[PDB]
Amino acid sequence: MRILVTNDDGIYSPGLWALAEAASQFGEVFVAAPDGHAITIAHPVRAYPHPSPLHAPHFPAYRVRGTPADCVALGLHLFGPVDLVLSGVNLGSNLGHEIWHSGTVAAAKQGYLFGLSAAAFSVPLNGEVPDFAGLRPWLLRTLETLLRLERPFLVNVNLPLRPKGFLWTRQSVRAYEGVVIPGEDPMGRPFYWFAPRPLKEAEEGTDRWAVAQGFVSATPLRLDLTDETRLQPTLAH
Amino acid sequence: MRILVTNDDGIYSPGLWALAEAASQFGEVFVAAPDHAITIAHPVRAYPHPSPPHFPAYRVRGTPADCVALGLHLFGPVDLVLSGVNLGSNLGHEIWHSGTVAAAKQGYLFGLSAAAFSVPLNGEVPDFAGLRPWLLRTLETLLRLERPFLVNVNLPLRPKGFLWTRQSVRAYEGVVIPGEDPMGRPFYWFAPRPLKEAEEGTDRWAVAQGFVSATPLRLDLTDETRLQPTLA
Amino acid sequence: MRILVTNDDGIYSPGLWALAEAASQFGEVFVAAPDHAITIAHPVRAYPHPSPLHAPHFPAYRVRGTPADCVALGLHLFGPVDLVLSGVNLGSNLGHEIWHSGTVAAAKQGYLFGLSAAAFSVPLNGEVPDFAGLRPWLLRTLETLLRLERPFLVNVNLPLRPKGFLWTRQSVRAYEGVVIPGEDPMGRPFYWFAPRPLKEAEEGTDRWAVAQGFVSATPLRLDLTDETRLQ
Amino acid sequence: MRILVTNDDGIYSPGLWALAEAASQFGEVFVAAPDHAITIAHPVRAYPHPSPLHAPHFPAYRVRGTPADCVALGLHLFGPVDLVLSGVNLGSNLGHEIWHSGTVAAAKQGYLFGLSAAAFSVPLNGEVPDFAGLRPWLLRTLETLLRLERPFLVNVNLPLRPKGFLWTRQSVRAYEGVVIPGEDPMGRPFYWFAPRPLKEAEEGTDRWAVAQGFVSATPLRLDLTDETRLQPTL
């Protein structure tokens, strides 16, 4: 079991090393983390060997001057063959509508596009970093569960600061109300505050609802964005 | 009908005005385009901008999603959000990281109908005058759909037809080619390639055949075949 | 003495905490590092941050802004501050590099506010700094700076394994433009830029000193005016 | 004389073409403008850029890099070059702003390569600059610059409607910190920074000069060493 660990926050993020350490209990771990979200193809990318931190076990590692997906492409090359791609633990949530724009998810998705199993890991912050020592038991429990899954898999994981359980969830998909509030800076110049708000509370069974309940959320994701119910649409006239 | 037109290439792209003009044949058009989620951490600046026909327009120092939120405030009420015409394809796996699509998706999240428009490139620059008839046809077709809708459109340089399509979803094999710059420093080229030919009925397949591709999109990324009960 | 410590690499950089710890040996340290001018346009966010596990406790904030922003915000949240220390940066800040250095800009901003300040950097050249080994030298350097008349503005570059300390002047070499063409996968062209210095660094300059293995300390001016060209 | 003209605002700035046209009265002009340090991480892309129907033609490239990259590439594609002109920037570059100016960085890069160079900027103050009105002043300034001993490095700020020309020194004022808290409509806290200078700009400085209506030209030094402190009293 060879595991490539990457993230979106960069090579110095405490979240990256917490995931690398948790993952090492399940196989050999290699790290490639960044110094857009797609693989850079128009030109060469720089990547250099990087010494893992003093207060973490040792892990072979590279700092990549590219995107999280670039880290996956490079990692599969330098440390091949790789069986699993783990991305995170991101300092900040990746829930509901957020999954679309997540670099952390983008790395995991890239691993899956290459035919490997993958999972993204994130922790909701709201002004307060996480305690990775306390989350460790939960990181391990989550990884254990993921490894029993039929492969390949693609899962998006969100762990609350202090977990009280685990739940497989679906993505929260809420409609939003547009809220724009005009304002002016200290210089009298105008600007606009954007504060779009969801129309309802997160529904039970969703990732958003689960973390709010103190549960680790695991959402299996698909790659296909096709709305399969509208391929032969009824047209008015 | 009131239509907000935006894009990802910015206020100076000819594709934007081509889209704005085509849309004007179906309703009142307003433009808000960048100078991918909605900016909330800080406020956004936006300025009136002249169109190169005339359209009320703003240049926004934010993301395409920002342009949609701002356009709604500046030009509300709005019924339809159109994004593009992007110079470059937004096919298959590209849909995920597309700013053009992100704007259309934002409009849909606000309860409106939306569509993204892109034209695959390389070597040849789009002739929007030639594309106009196909743009109008596509728009006319989209406006016959049950609402609301969210569709991703890719038009080839010179279309010969229109097809509804599903997104191309292919596996890739990694390709990494180590190298050195003229100063002997190391670097890596990435050239991952698709494992097979695009499937029939997919967006990538359709454009390759010279047809306009229109893929309806789903917001929910949940894979229900892998949902699970609790073990309590 | 109250000391504000910041940097350009961010709140998670090991060089940041190495500087804070070394500084704590001379006064009470407060930290504000980014998550180069002061952001006057829009509002900036800042959050209380916990000091690293294996490091002394330091009141600290993670700032969603520039190094100069950290200085401005820091003087507000921890005022009064006597000294601003920026670094230790991972990468050199020698000669022509000083002008556009973010680490240096934080220090300059402190000076602009009427305080003493110093920037600390360690040229890497492919390796990584060992802050445990550099501590004695960081301390010796701080000790020497605190003997200066206040306020002062000094740029410090510490080689990985220092064998001495020297006051230096900034190296100012002329460069030669080296451009080598190449092509992307579509055969489209691009160019590699590799400008190179024309001569060796002059003795006594910051570049020269680090190449000798010495810690370089360059006092900086704020005035870019070339007085010899006025009149 | 061959002249490389670049800027920080980009290939479509009217300020760029005004400078290029003024420079053409003095020698052959070539343009390389962005699409502050030289990029060495990856290679930089550049593409031939066309001249408009109603404009004199200048060989030019749009460069996907920094203003400094434009200078290096420009020296390669159009070399040999004798002078590097950067601007005209839409917005001032006075006093403390000089350190963060991309317009100035390009001129400085030219100087680092052994050439003469000058940066040009116009403070906006809520107006759109009139380059037909500024042209005479651009020409007078170039005339002054071109008789200087070479190489030179000068930072020029032209007021919207100049009435004179002054050699100035950079304004260097101390500041007082001003931080004013606030919170977004969602109740989240944030901070506004509004540091302010302790005094009015001194006579003879670039800021004073422009406030008075004069074109300001400041010769710049590369050496940031404060030599009055090379052997301090500890």
Coordinates of C-alpha atoms in Angstrom, one line a residue, chain A residues 37-38 96-103 105-107 109-110 112-113 154 156 171 221-226, chain B residues 36 90-102 105 152 167-169 217-222:
Chain A
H37 CA -6.6 23.5 -10.0
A38 CA -5.9 21.7 -13.2
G96 CA -21.9 21.5 -0.1
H97 CA -21.4 24.1 -2.9
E98 CA -17.8 24.5 -1.8
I99 CA -16.7 21.2 -3.2
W100 CA -16.8 22.6 -6.7
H101 CA -14.0 25.1 -6.1
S102 CA -11.9 23.1 -3.7
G103 CA -8.2 22.6 -4.5
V105 CA -10.9 18.1 -3.6
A106 CA -9.3 18.8 -7.0
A107 CA -6.2 16.8 -5.9
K109 CA -10.3 14.0 -7.9
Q110 CA -7.1 14.0 -10.0
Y112 CA -9.3 9.3 -9.2
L113 CA -9.0 10.5 -12.8
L154 CA -13.5 9.1 -4.3
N156 CA -14.9 14.0 0.5
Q171 CA -23.8 16.8 -0.6
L221 CA -18.5 11.9 -5.1
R222 CA -19.1 11.3 -8.8
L223 CA -17.0 12.8 -11.7
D224 CA -19.9 13.1 -14.1
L225 CA -21.7 16.4 -14.0
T226 CA -24.4 15.4 -16.5
Chain B
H36 CA -14.3 31.1 -8.7
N90 CA -15.0 23.7 -21.6
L91 CA -15.5 20.0 -22.4
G92 CA -15.5 17.0 -20.1
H93 CA -13.2 17.1 -17.1
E94 CA -12.7 20.8 -17.9
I95 CA -16.2 21.7 -16.7
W96 CA -15.1 21.4 -13.1
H97 CA -12.5 24.2 -13.2
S98 CA -14.3 26.5 -15.6
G99 CA -15.0 30.1 -14.6
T100 CA -17.5 30.4 -17.4
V101 CA -19.4 27.5 -16.1
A102 CA -19.0 28.8 -12.5
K105 CA -23.9 27.7 -12.0
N152 CA -23.1 23.9 -20.9
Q167 CA -20.3 15.1 -20.3
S168 CA -17.3 13.1 -21.6
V169 CA -15.8 11.2 -18.6
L217 CA -25.7 20.0 -15.8
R218 CA -26.5 18.7 -12.3
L219 CA -25.4 20.5 -9.1
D220 CA -25.4 17.5 -6.8
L221 CA -22.0 15.7 -6.9
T222 CA -23.2 13.0 -4.6

